[PDB]
RNA sequence: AUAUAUUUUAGUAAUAGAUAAAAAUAUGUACAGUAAAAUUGUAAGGAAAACAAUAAUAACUUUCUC
RNA sequence: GAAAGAAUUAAAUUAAUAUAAUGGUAUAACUGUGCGAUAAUUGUAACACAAACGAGUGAAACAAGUACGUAAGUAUGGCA
């Protein structure tokens, strides 16, 4: 009927498939449904607020940069030129790592190079 | 001969019958059409017998 | 010639009744080369893993911070620089 | 059929008739997939995404600061040119195609607080070419992909036909999977930390790699996939293993911006940039 | 805690069921849902875990937001803006959501869903837009009741009709239905549910049922026929069922003549239109209007011309459509209309 | 020798009825291969894209702003009407039947169901 | 922990989306959508296998916010 | 100021159309999908086109029944 390789392929396929592995549908009572809706809506609102806060902050930073660069242009042309360069190949430093869940054994390195 | 002619005879026993063409080894062709003797849509079935290209009956019940 | 798994009749998922594939996943703790632990969701059943070779001990990811090995092991009593100076006369070439 | 003439009749009102809602056929389908009452419901925002949080906090501000060019105006792309009306044959003529290209190119905007570059989507294309002989290899590749991602793969089929490579048309051959949001972020984090350090001699992603507009890519060999922890935990379950292409799609206007963004997430870049 | 206060706020914003309210607001998931009436089913049921504390937090968050909105709402002077503020404050209230979703909107009980309350009215409007309004629009366009009678419609009020007096059965007519001559023998009952903010005391309404498809053999075309005409009707958000109780004999500009389609004349559209009156400033009370009853004719009726004359704006519509059956002759006889014509089966 | 001496006849595919021309129900206004002209007001279209009159009237060729880049043939019910008819005005309809003044005929018609 | 009995599971097989230019039901109807080429890339991949990306947002509605 | 939606504009019929070539087709006639598998049904067909006759073509309408569609309606085989 089937080889051992064929069997193992079928098993692998099954791992991915939804055939006889999935539970019943999540039914709720009307009160429960409402509670869920209120949880979700509030959360969504909170997320929107956070986005606006961050977005606003970014806008403020941009405005400050603009204000700075105009001033620099007014005062010292050479300094302005130096500031406003193409940073095409700018690379973030490899020490600035993505913050983990829990910290390492040695928290901070005081010596380098 | 690739496409043969057949006679579909009405199931409501009027005697009315309609003729159609099929491929030589096509499945048994039953169709519901108007029977004017009875004045309604009835089943038509092949009056004669003939050989068919035997397809394997696809199994929905997961075998073995 | 072509090796295949021959298909059965497909099961009709009705419109609206299609359900998203939520695979069974465990919360797995990865301890990296150093003691920094990180939680990640994973399909294989293992609550804890500790890694040997990671970005946190690779020189490319932190610049600021086995035949040769075999040779070192089995010529260890001799201790093999001074040795280079001894065995490097540059007249013959 | 009395005719094939398609011709949508005009209306006498501005109300937008959603035809789906007027039926009673698919009552489960009227609910959005986000809604709990739909069978298509899935918990989306299950836990705090770490890479995304990092981007929000540290990187995004830094990226904005990098990309500020003073009084930078919009750079319009190559577009379809109109004809000068110096002849009456120009009068209903289609426009001249773009200068260099056949297809039109997009406008490059100055980076401000709104349009800072960020990760949009990852796609993991795995086309196993031995599966022209063995269909089961495609299945194994798809499983591997699923294991790696925690996301449902989609089967790739042979779209073309060719004799030199023993390839038919309409044959299942490997799989793909578009990751988005938190799963994608996790996959990137795994790539940065676990897998790409265990490749022995890897300098980086090439600086000559990428789209012209905010898309960067690279690929992993069958040797490299054995470092993924789902694969890594058991060598025995995976005798065979398949390479893959990894298309990273950013919200970057240009490719150097996208490269910079990826560097922020600890992706090393080695080659000479364009 | 603004949503627990009911000093200034209406009673309708609360849930009237006590058990349901208790279930909503508890400190642990101990109680079982009032919705599940059966004991065995309650036993079987299991709500999702951790739902209570999070729900409480969400309530607090949205309650705070509502309170903040109310701080603005009371300072506001202009009425539409104030209403919008009120809506914003209370729309995310769980109790009002429960009330609206799970109790009838058509024949709303005032204590549960009060359409005097702005939030509930907004909810009702949204519900109407989701399905019933779209359906009505489709039936107007497909049947060709808009351009044939009255150019366009901008649906504002939800209009539902009924024929209670003829047969006995209770049924709200779905737009574009085929009703028997027995069903539509006696007059209908309207319900004009208004969702916009409008002056309830001043605003009057007119209702016109028009039959565009009565055949005129001189013209070799059709003509309109005003089958039923009411004017100067007073609506209120909750008190809105236009019945012989409400309107007086003075309000009837053309009293109900039934659908009596001729044999082979075809299917006849009867499309009720609901207009609101023009509102005059510097005049307290409801501004009436006089109709020249000799000028307007029933056997031929320019609806558009009439609208132009009295400066009406069509807010709502509904439509049924009648064709010939055996009982139309009986209906004619009852009303004292003539025998009724019979046309050739072929449209030659 | 070998000669290419073979060809089908011309399909008579002009306009069979012209602007301002009186028509009757069923009459073919256009024969064509594909919709060069689209079926306009009071006009049908056949299997061979043949425009035919649904009603008695006046054949009119026109453009409609609703369908730009499309020519139309329709049938105006009189000569007075500009057949790209006004959109929000009511549709000019033909009753097209006659009442059975004859008593017997009317009775027969009443009987027939 | 172990024995018997009575059951229950394991037949492990793909679509999870009204799917949308790999292949497959070529006539009806209902609902919905848009192709191709060329270009820039990417593990074996090379002119030629697969996947990604490549025209413009003025006005409008809703949501959050200064 | 931002997010989402509705979308609109430009371009396109160079792909695709069971099949030649031509005309048509994105408002899609092309493609996907649910139901279905019925209208690839039954009697009368006027009136046109074409046309020596024999034939050929489009087809309103009337009547019987069927399938899909919330409805409007559509279907008397296939874009021609
Ligand atoms: Mg020719
Ligand atoms: Mg062509
Ligand atoms: Mg002639
Ligand atoms: Mg002849
Ligand atoms: Mg077709
Ligand atoms: Mg075809």
From Swiss-Prot, chain A:
Gene Ontology molecular functions: structural constituent of ribosome
GO cellular component, one term: mitochondrial inner membrane
Entry's localization field: Mitochondrion
One Gene Ontology term from the biological process aspect of the record: mitochondrial translation
Alphabetic keyword roster: Mitochondrion, Ribonucleoprotein, Ribosomal protein, Transit peptide
Function: Component of the mitochondrial ribosome (mitoribosome), a dedicated translation machinery responsible for the synthesis of mitochondrial genome-encoded proteins, including at least some of the essential transmembrane subunits of the mitochondrial respiratory chain. The mitoribosomes are attached to the mitochondrial inner membrane and translation products are cotranslationally integrated into the membrane.
Other remarks in the entry: Present with 6300 molecules/cell in log phase SD medium.
Subunit architecture: Component of the mitochondrial large ribosomal subunit (mt-LSU). Mature yeast 74S mitochondrial ribosomes consist of a small (37S) and a large (54S) subunit. The 37S small subunit contains a 15S ribosomal RNA (15S mt-rRNA) and 34 different proteins. The 54S large subunit contains a 21S rRNA (21S mt-rRNA) and 46 different proteins.
Family: Belongs to the mitochondrion-specific ribosomal protein mL40 family.
Protein known as: Large ribosomal subunit protein mL40
Swiss-Prot record, chain B:
Domain of life: Eukaryota
Subcellular locations according to the entry: Mitochondrion
Keywords per UniProt: Mitochondrion, Ribonucleoprotein, Ribosomal protein
GO MF, one annotated term: structural constituent of ribosome
InterPro entries: Mitoribosomal_protein_bL33, Ribosomal_bL33, Ribosomal_bL33_sf, Ribosomal_zn-bd
SUPFAM superfamilies tied to this protein: Zn-binding ribosomal proteins
GO-annotated cellular components: mitochondrial inner membrane; mitochondrial large ribosomal subunit; mitochondrion
GO terms (BP aspect): mitochondrial translation
Job description of the protein: Component of the mitochondrial ribosome (mitoribosome), a dedicated translation machinery responsible for the synthesis of mitochondrial genome-encoded proteins, including at least some of the essential transmembrane subunits of the mitochondrial respiratory chain. The mitoribosomes are attached to the mitochondrial inner membrane and translation products are cotranslationally integrated into the membrane.
Other comment: Present with 2500 molecules/cell in log phase SD medium.
Subunit structure, interactors included: Component of the mitochondrial large ribosomal subunit (mt-LSU). Mature yeast 74S mitochondrial ribosomes consist of a small (37S) and a large (54S) subunit. The 37S small subunit contains a 15S ribosomal RNA (15S mt-rRNA) and 34 different proteins. The 54S large subunit contains a 21S rRNA (21S mt-rRNA) and 46 different proteins. bL33m stabilizes the tRNA acceptor stem in the E-site.
Family note: Belongs to the bacterial ribosomal protein bL33 family.
Gene for this chain: MRPL39
Curated annotation (Swiss-Prot), chain C:
GO molecular function: structural constituent of ribosome
A single cellular component GO annotation: mitochondrial inner membrane
Keywords: Mitochondrion, Ribonucleoprotein, Ribosomal protein, Transit peptide
Cellular localisation: Mitochondrion
Superkingdom of this protein's organism: Eukaryota
Stretches the record annotates as Sufficient for general mitochondrial translation: 17-80
GO biological process: mitochondrial translation
Assembly information from the UniProt record: Component of the mitochondrial large ribosomal subunit (mt-LSU). Mature yeast 74S mitochondrial ribosomes consist of a small (37S) and a large (54S) subunit. The 37S small subunit contains a 15S ribosomal RNA (15S mt-rRNA) and 34 different proteins. The 54S large subunit contains a 21S rRNA (21S mt-rRNA) and 46 different proteins.
Reported function: Component of the mitochondrial ribosome (mitoribosome), a dedicated translation machinery responsible for the synthesis of mitochondrial genome-encoded proteins, including at least some of the essential transmembrane subunits of the mitochondrial respiratory chain. The mitoribosomes are attached to the mitochondrial inner membrane and translation products are cotranslationally integrated into the membrane. Overexpression of bL31m suppresses mutations in the COX2 leader peptide-encoding and initiation codon regions.
Family: Belongs to the bacterial ribosomal protein bL31 family. Highly divergent.
Name of the protein in question: Large ribosomal subunit protein bL31m
Organism lineage string: Eukaryota, Fungi, Dikarya, Ascomycota, Saccharomycotina
From Swiss-Prot, chain E:
Protein name listed in UniProt: Large ribosomal subunit protein mL38
Major subcellular location class: mitochondrion
GO MF assignments: structural constituent of ribosome
SUPFAM superfamilies: PEBP-like
Ranges annotated as spanning the membrane: none
The UniProt record lists the keyword Ribonucleoprotein: yes
Something else known: Present with 7700 molecules/cell in log phase SD medium.
Gene it is expressed from: MRPL35
Family: Belongs to the phosphatidylethanolamine-binding protein family. Mitochondrion-specific ribosomal protein mL38 subfamily.
Keyword DNA-binding carried by entry: no
A Pfam family of this chain: PBP
């Amino acid at each position: 009927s089937l080889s051992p390789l064929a069997q193992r392929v079928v098993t692998q396929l099954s791992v991915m498939s939804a055939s006889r592995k999935q539970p019943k549908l999540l039914k709720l009572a009307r009160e429960d449904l409402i509670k869920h809706q209120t949880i979700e809506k509030c959360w969504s609102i909170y997320q929107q607020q956070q986005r606006e806060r961050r977005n606003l902050q970014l806008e403020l930073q941009y405005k400050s940069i603009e204000r700075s660069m105009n001033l620099l242009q007014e005062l010292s042309p050479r300094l302005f030129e130096a500031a406003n360069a193409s940073e095409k190949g700018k690379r973030f430093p490899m020490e600035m790592k993505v913050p983990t869940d829990f910290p390492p054994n040695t928290l901070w390195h005081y010596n380098f190079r | 001969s690739k496409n043969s002619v057949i006679k579909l005879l009405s199931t409501a026993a009027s005697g009315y019958s309609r003729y159609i063409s099929i491929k030589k080894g096509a499945p048994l062709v039953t169709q519901v059409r108007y029977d004017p003797v009875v004045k309604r849509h009835v089943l038509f079935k092949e009056a004669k017998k003939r050989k068919v290209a035997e397809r394997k009956p696809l199994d929905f019940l997961r075998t073995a | 010639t072509r090796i295949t798994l021959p298909r059965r009749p497909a099961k009709k998922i009705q419109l609206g009744k299609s359900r998203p594939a939520i695979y069974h996943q465990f919360n797995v703790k990865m301890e990296l080369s150093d003691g920094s632990v990180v939680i990640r969701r994973s399909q294989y059943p293992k609550g804890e893993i500790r890694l040997i070779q990671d970005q946190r001990n690779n020189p490319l990811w932190n610049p600021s911070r086995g035949s040769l090995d075999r040779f070192n092991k089995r010529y260890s009593s001799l201790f093999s620089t001074v040795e280079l100076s001894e065995e490097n006369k540059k007249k013959t070439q | 059929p009395k005719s094939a003439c398609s011709l949508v009749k005009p209306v006498h009102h501005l109300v937008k008739i959603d035809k789906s809602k007027l039926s009673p056929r698919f009552p489960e389908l009227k609910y959005d997939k986000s809604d709990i009452r739909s069978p298509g419901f899935k918990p989306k925002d299950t836990h705090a995404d770490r890479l995304n949080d990092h981007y929000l906090n540290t990187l995004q501000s830094d990226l904005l600061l990098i990309n500020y060019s003073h009084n930078a105006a919009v750079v319009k792309g190559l577009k379809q040119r109109a004809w000068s009306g110096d002849s009456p044959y120009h009068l209903n003529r289609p426009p001249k195609n773009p200068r260099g290209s056949k297809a039109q190119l997009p406008d490059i905007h100055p980076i401000k607080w709104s349009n800072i570059p960020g990760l949009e989507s990852v796609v993991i294309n795995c086309f196993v070419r031995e599966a022209r002989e063995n269909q089961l290899l495609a299945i194994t590749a798809a499983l591997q992909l699923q294991q790696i991602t925690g996301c449902k793969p989609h089967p790739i089929f042979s779209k073309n036909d060719v004799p030199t490579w023993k390839l038919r048309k309409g044959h299942q051959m490997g799989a793909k999977v578009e990751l988005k949001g938190k799963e994608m972020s996790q996959f990137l984090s795994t790539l940065t930390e676990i897998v790409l350090p265990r490749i022995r001699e890897y300098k980086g992603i090439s600086n000559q790699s990428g789209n012209r507009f905010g898309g960067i890519s690279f690929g992993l060999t069958a040797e490299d996939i054995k470092f993924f922890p789902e694969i890594d935990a058991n060598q025995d379950s995976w005798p065979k293993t398949f390479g893959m292409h990894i298309n990273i799609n950013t919200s970057a206007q240009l490719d150097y911006q996208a490269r910079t963004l990826l560097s922020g997430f600890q992706f090393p870049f080695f080659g000479e940039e364009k | 805690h603004i949503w627990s206060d009911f000093t200034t706020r209406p009673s309708s914003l609360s849930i009237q069921s006590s058990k349901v309210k208790n279930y909503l607001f508890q400190k642990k998931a101990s109680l079982d849902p009032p919705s599940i009436s059966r004991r065995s089913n309650r036993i079987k049921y299991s709500p999702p875990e951790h739902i209570d504390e999070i729900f409480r937090m969400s309530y607090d968050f949205l309650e705070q937001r509502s309170s903040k909105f109310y701080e603005l709402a009371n300072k506001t002077k202009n009425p539409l803006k104030k209403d919008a503020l009120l809506i914003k404050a209370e729309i995310n209230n769980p109790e009002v959501q429960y009330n609206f979703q799970f109790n009838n909107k058509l024949n709303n009980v005032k204590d549960i869903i009060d359409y005097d309350v702005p939030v509930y009215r907004h909810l009702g409007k949204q519900h109407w837009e989701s399905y019933g309004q779209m359906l009505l629009m489709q039936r107007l366009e497909t049947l060709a009741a808009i351009p044939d009678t009255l150019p366009t419609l901008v649906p504002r009020a939800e209009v539902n009709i009924k024929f209670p007096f003829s047969t006995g059965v209770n049924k709200w007519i779905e737009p574009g239905e085929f009703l028997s001559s027995n069903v539509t023998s006696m007059r209908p009952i309207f319900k004009i549910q208004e969702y916009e903010l409008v002056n309830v005391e001043k605003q009057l309404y007119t209702v016109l049922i028009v039959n565009p498809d009565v055949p005129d053999l001189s013209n070799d075309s059709f003509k309109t026929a005003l089958c039923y005409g009411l004017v100067n009707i007073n609506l209120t958000y909750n008190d809105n069922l236009i019945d012989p109780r409400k309107f007086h004999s003075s309000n009837i500009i053309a009293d109900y003549l039934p659908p009596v389609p001729e044999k082979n004349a075809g299917k006849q559209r009867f499309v009720v239109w609901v207009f609101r009156q023009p509102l005059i400033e510097d005049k307290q009370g409801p501004n009436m209007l006089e109709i020249d009853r000799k000028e307007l004719s029933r056997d031929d009726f320019d609806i558009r011309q009439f609208t132009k004359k009295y400066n009406l704006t069509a807010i709502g519509a509904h439509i049924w459509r009648s064709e010939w059956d055996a009982k139309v002759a009986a209906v004619r006889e009852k009303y004292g209309l003539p025998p009724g014509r019979v046309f050739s089966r072929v449209r030659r | 020798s070998r000669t290419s001496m073979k060809d089908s006849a011309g399909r008579r595919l002009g306009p069979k009825k012209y602007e301002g021309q009186d028509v009757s129900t069923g009459e073919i206004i256009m024969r064509q291969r594909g919709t060069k002209f689209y079926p306009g007001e009071n006009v049908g279209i056949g299997k061979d894209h043949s425009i035919f009159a649904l009603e008695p009237g006046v054949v009119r060729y026109y453009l409609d702003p609703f369908h730009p880049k499309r020519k139309f043939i329709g049938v105006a019910l009189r000569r007075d009407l500009k057949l790209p008819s006004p959109h929000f005005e009511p549709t000019v309809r033909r009753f097209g039947r006659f009442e059975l003044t004859n008593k017997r005929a009317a009775y027969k018609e009443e009987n027939s169901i």
